Amino acid sequence: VINTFDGVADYLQTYHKLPDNYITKSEAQALGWVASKGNLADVAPGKSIGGDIFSNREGKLPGKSGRTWREADINYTSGFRNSDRILYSSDWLIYKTTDAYQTFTKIR
Incomplete structure (x- = not known):
């Protein structure tokens, strides 16, 4: 269980999977x-929205002729x-944001 940027990265960068609490908008x-x-x-006690895909519909992420981008909620509890x-x-x-996709800052 975890909902922090680095925590999700460490968890994912190590287990290549999203924390035991990240479900996409899909589900x-x-x-x-x-x-x-x-x-x-x-419907998801102690869980957060994440796991979908971010078709860079903002021109704020590095693209390439062969790659993909995905998003996930950060710092959430119940609401x-x-x-x-x-x-x-x-x-x-x-990549991490704090104004809701508005601006973006890289962390790793």
């Missing part, structure tokens, strides 16, 4: 996610998302 949606509520700790998010590239690049 969050079929699981029964609703905008007029933003559920999470209820909804926030402005803290982590971006991990298929090239093993680690």
